[PDB]
Design a protein around this ligand. Sequence first.
Ligand code: SF4
Ligand SMILES: [Mg+2]
Ligand SMILES: [Mg+2]
Ligand SMILES: [Mg+2]
Ligand SMILES: [Mg+2]
Ligand SMILES: [Mg+2]
Ligand SMILES: [Mg+2]
Ligand SMILES: [Mg+2]
Ligand SMILES: [Mg+2]
Ligand SMILES: [Mg+2]
Ligand SMILES: [Mg+2]
Ligand SMILES: [Mg+2]
Ligand SMILES: [Mg+2]
Ligand SMILES: [Mg+2]
Ligand SMILES: [Mg+2]
Ligand SMILES: [Mg+2]
Ligand SMILES: [Mg+2]
Ligand SMILES: [Mg+2]
Ligand SMILES: [Mg+2]
Ligand SMILES: [Mg+2]
Ligand SMILES: [Mg+2]
Ligand SMILES: [Mg+2]
Ligand SMILES: [Mg+2]
Ligand SMILES: [Mg+2]
Ligand SMILES: [Mg+2]
Ligand SMILES: [Mg+2]
Ligand SMILES: [Mg+2]
Ligand SMILES: [Mg+2]
Ligand SMILES: [Mg+2]
Ligand SMILES: [Mg+2]
Ligand SMILES: [Mg+2]
Ligand SMILES: [Mg+2]
Ligand SMILES: [Mg+2]
Ligand SMILES: [Mg+2]
Ligand SMILES: [Mg+2]
Ligand SMILES: [Mg+2]
Ligand SMILES: [Mg+2]
Ligand SMILES: [Mg+2]
Ligand SMILES: [Mg+2]
Ligand SMILES: [Mg+2]
Ligand SMILES: [Mg+2]
Ligand SMILES: [Mg+2]
Ligand SMILES: [Mg+2]
Ligand SMILES: [Mg+2]
Ligand SMILES: [Mg+2]
Ligand SMILES: [Mg+2]
Ligand SMILES: [Mg+2]
Ligand SMILES: [Mg+2]
Ligand SMILES: [Mg+2]
Ligand SMILES: [Mg+2]
Ligand SMILES: [Mg+2]
Ligand SMILES: [Mg+2]
Ligand SMILES: [Mg+2]
Ligand SMILES: [Mg+2]
Ligand SMILES: [Mg+2]
Ligand SMILES: [Mg+2]
Ligand SMILES: [Mg+2]
Ligand SMILES: [Mg+2]
Ligand SMILES: [Mg+2]
Ligand SMILES: [Mg+2]
Ligand SMILES: [Mg+2]
Ligand SMILES: [Mg+2]
Ligand SMILES: [Mg+2]
Ligand SMILES: [Mg+2]
Ligand SMILES: [Mg+2]
Ligand SMILES: [Mg+2]
Ligand SMILES: [Mg+2]
Ligand SMILES: [Mg+2]
Ligand SMILES: [Mg+2]
Ligand SMILES: [Mg+2]
Ligand SMILES: [Mg+2]
Ligand SMILES: [Mg+2]
Ligand SMILES: [Mg+2]
Ligand SMILES: [Mg+2]
Ligand SMILES: [Mg+2]
Ligand SMILES: [Mg+2]
Ligand SMILES: [Mg+2]
Ligand SMILES: [Mg+2]
Ligand SMILES: [Mg+2]
Ligand SMILES: [Mg+2]
Ligand SMILES: [Mg+2]
Ligand SMILES: [Mg+2]
Ligand SMILES: [Mg+2]
Ligand SMILES: [Mg+2]
Ligand SMILES: [Mg+2]
Ligand SMILES: [Mg+2]
Ligand SMILES: [Mg+2]
Ligand SMILES: [Mg+2]
Ligand SMILES: [Mg+2]
Ligand SMILES: [Mg+2]
Ligand SMILES: [Mg+2]
Ligand SMILES: [Mg+2]
Lengths: 137, 122, 82, 99, 148, 208
Amino acid sequence: LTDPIADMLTRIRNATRVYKESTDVPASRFKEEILRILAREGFIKGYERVDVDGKPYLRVYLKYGPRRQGPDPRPEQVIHHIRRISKPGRRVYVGVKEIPRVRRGLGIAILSTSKGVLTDREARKLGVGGELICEVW
Amino acid sequence: PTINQLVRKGREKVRKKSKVPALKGAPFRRGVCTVVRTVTPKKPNSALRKVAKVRLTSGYEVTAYIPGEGHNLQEHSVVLIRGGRVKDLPGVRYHIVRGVYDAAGVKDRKKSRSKYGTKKPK
Amino acid sequence: MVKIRLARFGSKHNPHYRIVVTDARRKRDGKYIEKIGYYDPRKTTPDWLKVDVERARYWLSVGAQPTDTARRLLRQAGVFRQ
Amino acid sequence: PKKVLTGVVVSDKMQKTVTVLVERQFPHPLYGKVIKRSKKYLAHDPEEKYKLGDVVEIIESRPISKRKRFRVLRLVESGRMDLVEKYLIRRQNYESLSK
Amino acid sequence: DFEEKMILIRRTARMQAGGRRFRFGALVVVGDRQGRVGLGFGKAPEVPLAVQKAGYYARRNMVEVPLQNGTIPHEIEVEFGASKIVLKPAAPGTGVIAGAVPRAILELAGVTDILTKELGSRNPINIAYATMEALRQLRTKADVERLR
Amino acid sequence: GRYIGPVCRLCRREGVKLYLKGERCYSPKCAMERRPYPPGQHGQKRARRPSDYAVRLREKQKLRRIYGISERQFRNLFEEASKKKGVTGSVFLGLLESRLDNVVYRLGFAVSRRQARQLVRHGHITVNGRRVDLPSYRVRPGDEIAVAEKSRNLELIRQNLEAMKGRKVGPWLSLDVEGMKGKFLRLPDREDLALPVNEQLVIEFYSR
RNA sequence: CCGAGGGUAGGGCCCGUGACUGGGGCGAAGUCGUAACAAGGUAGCUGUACCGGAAGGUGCGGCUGGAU
RNA sequence: GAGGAAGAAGCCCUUCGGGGUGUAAACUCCUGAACCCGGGACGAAACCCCCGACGAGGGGACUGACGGUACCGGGGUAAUAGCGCCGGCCAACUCCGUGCCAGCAGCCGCGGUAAUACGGAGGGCGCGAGCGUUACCCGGAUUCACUGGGCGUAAAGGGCGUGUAGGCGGCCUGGGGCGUCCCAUGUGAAAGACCACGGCUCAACCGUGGGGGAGCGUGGGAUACGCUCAGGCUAGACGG
RNA sequence: GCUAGUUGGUGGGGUAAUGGCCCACCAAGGCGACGACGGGUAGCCGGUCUGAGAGGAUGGCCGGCCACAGGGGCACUGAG
Ligand code: SF4
Ligand SMILES: [Mg+2]
Ligand SMILES: [Mg+2]
Ligand SMILES: [Mg+2]
Ligand SMILES: [Mg+2]
Ligand SMILES: [Mg+2]
Ligand SMILES: [Mg+2]
Ligand SMILES: [Mg+2]
Ligand SMILES: [Mg+2]
Ligand SMILES: [Mg+2]
Ligand SMILES: [Mg+2]
Ligand SMILES: [Mg+2]
Ligand SMILES: [Mg+2]
Ligand SMILES: [Mg+2]
Ligand SMILES: [Mg+2]
Ligand SMILES: [Mg+2]
Ligand SMILES: [Mg+2]
Ligand SMILES: [Mg+2]
Ligand SMILES: [Mg+2]
Ligand SMILES: [Mg+2]
Ligand SMILES: [Mg+2]
Ligand SMILES: [Mg+2]
Ligand SMILES: [Mg+2]
Ligand SMILES: [Mg+2]
Ligand SMILES: [Mg+2]
Ligand SMILES: [Mg+2]
Ligand SMILES: [Mg+2]
Ligand SMILES: [Mg+2]
Ligand SMILES: [Mg+2]
Ligand SMILES: [Mg+2]
Ligand SMILES: [Mg+2]
Ligand SMILES: [Mg+2]
Ligand SMILES: [Mg+2]
Ligand SMILES: [Mg+2]
Ligand SMILES: [Mg+2]
Ligand SMILES: [Mg+2]
Ligand SMILES: [Mg+2]
Ligand SMILES: [Mg+2]
Ligand SMILES: [Mg+2]
Ligand SMILES: [Mg+2]
Ligand SMILES: [Mg+2]
Ligand SMILES: [Mg+2]
Ligand SMILES: [Mg+2]
Ligand SMILES: [Mg+2]
Ligand SMILES: [Mg+2]
Ligand SMILES: [Mg+2]
Ligand SMILES: [Mg+2]
Ligand SMILES: [Mg+2]
Ligand SMILES: [Mg+2]
Ligand SMILES: [Mg+2]
Ligand SMILES: [Mg+2]
Ligand SMILES: [Mg+2]
Ligand SMILES: [Mg+2]
Ligand SMILES: [Mg+2]
Ligand SMILES: [Mg+2]
Ligand SMILES: [Mg+2]
Ligand SMILES: [Mg+2]
Ligand SMILES: [Mg+2]
Ligand SMILES: [Mg+2]
Ligand SMILES: [Mg+2]
Ligand SMILES: [Mg+2]
Ligand SMILES: [Mg+2]
Ligand SMILES: [Mg+2]
Ligand SMILES: [Mg+2]
Ligand SMILES: [Mg+2]
Ligand SMILES: [Mg+2]
Ligand SMILES: [Mg+2]
Ligand SMILES: [Mg+2]
Ligand SMILES: [Mg+2]
Ligand SMILES: [Mg+2]
Ligand SMILES: [Mg+2]
Ligand SMILES: [Mg+2]
Ligand SMILES: [Mg+2]
Ligand SMILES: [Mg+2]
Ligand SMILES: [Mg+2]
Ligand SMILES: [Mg+2]
Ligand SMILES: [Mg+2]
Ligand SMILES: [Mg+2]
Ligand SMILES: [Mg+2]
Ligand SMILES: [Mg+2]
Ligand SMILES: [Mg+2]
Ligand SMILES: [Mg+2]
Ligand SMILES: [Mg+2]
Ligand SMILES: [Mg+2]
Ligand SMILES: [Mg+2]
Ligand SMILES: [Mg+2]
Ligand SMILES: [Mg+2]
Ligand SMILES: [Mg+2]
Ligand SMILES: [Mg+2]
Ligand SMILES: [Mg+2]
Ligand SMILES: [Mg+2]
Ligand SMILES: [Mg+2]
């Protein structure tokens, strides 16, 4: 397991595409700060530090839209799209002036700065840049 | 490829092959005709297309097409050539310019005269 | 010697000079040390001469040597007024 | 200011001169990945007091010889034969890279 | 009512003993230039029938596109099979920068200022289809907050 | 230089009346009144559906032929508008309507833009007192387009200013008749000129 | 002393050219047969080996991208 | 330039009725490129001279190659148009001639006796003192794909291991602050590019003024992530 | 795979000045898959053309730096 951050984004994405109420990821302080933002932006209902077989996990409670009417009842997602940006094979860093705007504004870019994990909107306010972790909408 | 593989090897910028090597970078080349004859074209066409074997100042000896109706070109005819293959005459990659050196224009030409070295009729 | 003179810019039959400090061995319109204003011999615009006197007097102070007509245009600018 | 580098002494078989391997990192100009490059410098050791495996600092200096334009500034750390072996093991791998 | 525009009329053939026997296909987009657009593909043994049959499905398959000052809210990229369509919001003085196929769909839906690009296979059918699904997934700041 | 050949064939081709002569343009002898179909052997044949490229080309030629201006100057004015600020469409028509020969026409000094050009070109016009014989001169807000004093006793300019004594002009214009002089107030809107031209199609033509 | 270079000798690389010779591409209006595509009339393909005017054949092993 | 026929001749097409070139021409009036005379520059005020003091300051004169040019004024003649294309892409169609011939051709393709594709003609489209052609560069070409591609059968997984270098790497804590992020500061010449104004009658061209940037030097600051050093842990891995 | 002034040292010569720049001796070192050595092509940049950008291509005109003056070698004069 070479990229826990991309493994968590993928655990969520695989979980949301089958409409799970939750899914557990192996826990870490950097992961919680990333989920901390998904809640504070409504992409998730939130998480809780659970344990499985004696090992510290993060149970992430997923969130979807209203049921739909037609041949496809399955409801619209709330996290339509979440993908890794900076990777172990290619670190990606932006200064404050080059922070991108995910989806014209309707989306969030998650950064790690020396003022902590922040959205692109948060980061522009505090005027810092950092490692472009991922993007969500 | 991975990002590391791209660092190690890069992307190959492939070169373009000139379709007119005998020109040696010029827009035109002067030559002298050696063989002036007709050549039958390939399928599915049938004709007797007029071709000249030209000995170029660039050193090359090539076969250029003689366009238009009728010409006045013979062995030793000085001639200017330009790029331009004839699709249906394999090996013919160049055209002789009518109306330069010993190439006459097309007689009684009225339309498209600038492409056949024909001056304006009064 | 560094000098103070007119490097011609502009166009044909439309001269516009920059009163300039440069090494005398430079070519006329070549890399100059500093610009200290403009000059327009034809008096087209209604302010056809300008001099940064804070600097032009420095270059005199430090050694520079204006040409004849550079000096005259530096005179109409009051760099010599006592 | 006089450029200062940090590297490990990978050779000392010269009189009054040690060979210091300096390393550096930067993003690839086009592919963004962080890549490592390295360069050796012939370092003036006027007291032959620096030993194989010493992480040291060299400072840009007026020319001492042909290729010697750096003197050792100070010791940074000692006993780094782990780094000297990586360099030597690569040089030993070159014999297999021929024909 | 709804404005229509023929996009594609092609003739396909099928083989039998005695020879080939044809059939026609009509790509028609309908819309009001106000936020409502539909696309339908119609096949019939003669051109006018297929054209009319295509207008029919176009009304039975519509999409409301969230126009905002004549541009789309957010940039979107959709792949339909091997065809890919790109749409990017654009300011007032822009125009509709698009190939013939996507231009017709954006124009009739009221889009006046957008940047587009076709990539991948440029098959007009699959490109027309990919433009609809792109419009169909456009979202407003409203729906974003509604979802969260 | 400019196009100098038969001008009714343009209107007949464009399917609309372009007022390229002034007087006969309102008579029953106007070509579009008698033969509102394109010139040549095939004018009275049934038109087939035009390609999208034809449509945009036709609109562009309609807009361009109106001013009798060259495709070169046309395209250059357009390119300026494209690099200019705001909406290219408005600015294009604005910079079009700011030509001296065009303003001279709008002021009723001349019955046609051709006439205006020959007026400007023959120096019978001034700008802010300064004589200007350049048809492509750009008029600016605040200017003043007067008849040359040494030309005020000219039959053609007389009859034309007669016919304008109380004729309106564009809101962006004024005209002191009898004094033979007007003012360019501001650069016009598309609203101020209902030219039979969708200009967006001209944008789309040049975006190919 | 060094030294432009000239001289003797021996190497290396590259270009142009050569009696003759190898196969290749194209032309097509020819001669021979019909190897492949259907079970293509011996299922095909295949590495190798031996052989035959030619396509190709056969041996050994492999593959199914083989009909019934 | 304006006016100027239900519309001359000629030429082209035609169902022989007529249609087209076409307000195009002729014709009328208006203006007046050219050229003919009058005047005629800006660029040139310094060095020098005189008073002052060989300075400050003031006063005086000489000098134009371009050039009798630009330009101003006065007069004044209707006064060069050509080139490409009209099968599809691609805007623009008919008649004759030819009959797989002669020829066209960027690609697809045209020509074998009713060719919108050859040759001419009429007509049409596009540009215009230019119009086309050839060569070459970037584009379209996400067709070397960082942005922004792929590899079962389309071109593409190495015959299989083992392993060197290298690339990459788990949970928690602290030190350092190399990467990384922020602030300040130096550098980033002029021209060009861009925004505004202005000077040649416009423009081209040119002048004046305006805003930056990356990158690198320096000082200061942050520590999440990556790195490094240290200490722990057992979910990876290895062993009993 | 490359290297004998080759890489380093001591001494001296030489220059306006550091240096194997040069010489004498001592040592056996220096460089290379992060591409040495060799072959080919090319003056480099501000910029220029194109491109949505990233990028690609280019360096004529103007400005900066370099190199050269029939092919080579050389020093003299000199602040240069
Ligand atoms: S008379 Fe009619 S057709 Fe002729 S130019 Fe005037 S408006 Fe156009
Ligand atoms: Mg990325
Ligand atoms: Mg010759
Ligand atoms: Mg044929
Ligand atoms: Mg002869
Ligand atoms: Mg060609
Ligand atoms: Mg022609
Ligand atoms: Mg032709
Ligand atoms: Mg002098
Ligand atoms: Mg030494
Ligand atoms: Mg909606
Ligand atoms: Mg597809
Ligand atoms: Mg796909
Ligand atoms: Mg927007
Ligand atoms: Mg495709
Ligand atoms: Mg296609
Ligand atoms: Mg009107
Ligand atoms: Mg349309
Ligand atoms: Mg704009
Ligand atoms: Mg007069
Ligand atoms: Mg109108
Ligand atoms: Mg374009
Ligand atoms: Mg010798
Ligand atoms: Mg010798
Ligand atoms: Mg000798
Ligand atoms: Mg042979
Ligand atoms: Mg067989
Ligand atoms: Mg058989
Ligand atoms: Mg068989
Ligand atoms: Mg066999
Ligand atoms: Mg045999
Ligand atoms: Mg035999
Ligand atoms: Mg046998
Ligand atoms: Mg067998
Ligand atoms: Mg097997
Ligand atoms: Mg007339
Ligand atoms: Mg009639
Ligand atoms: Mg008629
Ligand atoms: Mg008639
Ligand atoms: Mg007639
Ligand atoms: Mg005179
Ligand atoms: Mg003068
Ligand atoms: Mg004198
Ligand atoms: Mg004085
Ligand atoms: Mg006059
Ligand atoms: Mg008169
Ligand atoms: Mg006339
Ligand atoms: Mg053309
Ligand atoms: Mg046909
Ligand atoms: Mg075209
Ligand atoms: Mg057409
Ligand atoms: Mg014949
Ligand atoms: Mg015929
Ligand atoms: Mg053709
Ligand atoms: Mg023809
Ligand atoms: Mg011109
Ligand atoms: Mg040309
Ligand atoms: Mg290209
Ligand atoms: Mg590309
Ligand atoms: Mg990629
Ligand atoms: Mg592909
Ligand atoms: Mg395998
Ligand atoms: Mg192999
Ligand atoms: Mg590591
Ligand atoms: Mg880690
Ligand atoms: Mg740490
Ligand atoms: Mg720490
Ligand atoms: Mg740091
Ligand atoms: Mg800076
Ligand atoms: Mg600059
Ligand atoms: Mg002005
Ligand atoms: Mg910028
Ligand atoms: Mg710093
Ligand atoms: Mg540890
Ligand atoms: Mg375990
Ligand atoms: Mg075990
Ligand atoms: Mg020494
Ligand atoms: Mg010296
Ligand atoms: Mg040496
Ligand atoms: Mg020695
Ligand atoms: Mg020895
Ligand atoms: Mg290296
Ligand atoms: Mg390599
Ligand atoms: Mg050479
Ligand atoms: Mg691109
Ligand atoms: Mg170059
Ligand atoms: Mg050049
Ligand atoms: Mg130069
Ligand atoms: Mg030399
Ligand atoms: Mg010499
Ligand atoms: Mg010579
Ligand atoms: Mg010599």
